[PDB]
Amino acid sequence: KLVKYQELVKKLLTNYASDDVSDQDVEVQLILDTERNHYQWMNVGWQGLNRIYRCVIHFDIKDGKIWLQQNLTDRNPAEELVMMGVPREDIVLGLQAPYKRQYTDYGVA
Amino acid sequence: GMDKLVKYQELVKKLLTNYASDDVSDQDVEVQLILDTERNHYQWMNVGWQGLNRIYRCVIHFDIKDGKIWLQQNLTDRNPAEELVMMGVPREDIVLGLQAPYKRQYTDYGVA
Numbered sequence A: 001k002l003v004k005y006q007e008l009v010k011k012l013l014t015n016y017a018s019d020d021v022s023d024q025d026v027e028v029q030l031i032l033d034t035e036r037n038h039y040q041w042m043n044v045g046w047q048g049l050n051r052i053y054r055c056v057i058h059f060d061i062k063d064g065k066i067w068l069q070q071n072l073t074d075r076n077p078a079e080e081l082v083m084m085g086v087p088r089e090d091i092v093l094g095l096q097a098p099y100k101r102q103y104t105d106y107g108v109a
Numbered sequence B: 001g002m003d004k005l006v007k008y009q010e011l012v013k014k015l016l017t018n019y020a021s022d023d024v025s026d027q028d029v030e031v032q033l034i035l036d037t038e039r040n041h042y043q044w045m046n047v048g049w050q051g052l053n054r055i056y057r058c059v060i061h062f063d064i065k066d067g068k069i070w071l072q073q074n075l076t077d078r079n080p081a082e083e084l085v086m087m088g089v090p091r092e093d094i095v096l097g098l099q100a101p102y103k104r105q106y107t108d109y110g111v112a
């Protein structure tokens, strides 16, 4: 499932990054590391004297599962992946405390 | 050109790998080396849990944009910009992205 899950995570993150309307002073970054399987959508820049430096969504792929590590949106990218064909057991909520995961409807490592 | 881009890619990856191999984090915290050589984004992050406390932080981040190395984040008490210089990177080809735009032309380094 590695190639399949790489393609799905890349597609979702690309959708979000391509739809991000941050102004000219904030760079929208898409970060795809296919060797260590770390995938991110970032905002990096400035609004006046305020530093904007934030990962909006982060997914890893580790041992056959997709790990959601960060979600700053009001949306549910884990369910979006499900809606796109990833079974819930193959999603790990990394951004949730480990002890909770076996009681969630998603997977464990 | 291309020799200069690859030079800078290698130097950034070597420094970050250097930085990350000195990590002191717990076994419950991963050290992530996030290296995108197609889009030229390079990070060292710590990702995990300390008890019920979420660890999610980028210790250093470099981009390479139009052939210049941008330092975007540095939570260490090291000076990665100076290290790159000591490694052969011209000052003028380093941009302090972590400094406000208006200041960059007045730093020791460079601008876009």
Ligand SMILES: [Cl-]
Pocket (backbone or CB within 6 Å): A025, A044, A045, A046, B097, B101
């Ligand atoms: Cl900027």
Ligand SMILES: [Cl-]
Pocket (backbone or CB within 6 Å): A036, B031, B032, B033, B034
């Ligand atoms: Cl890694």
Ligand SMILES: [Cl-]
Pocket (backbone or CB within 6 Å): B056, B057, B058, B059
């Ligand atoms: Cl951070």
Ligand SMILES: [Cl-]
Pocket (backbone or CB within 6 Å): B095, B101, B104, B110, B111, B112
């Ligand atoms: Cl600049």
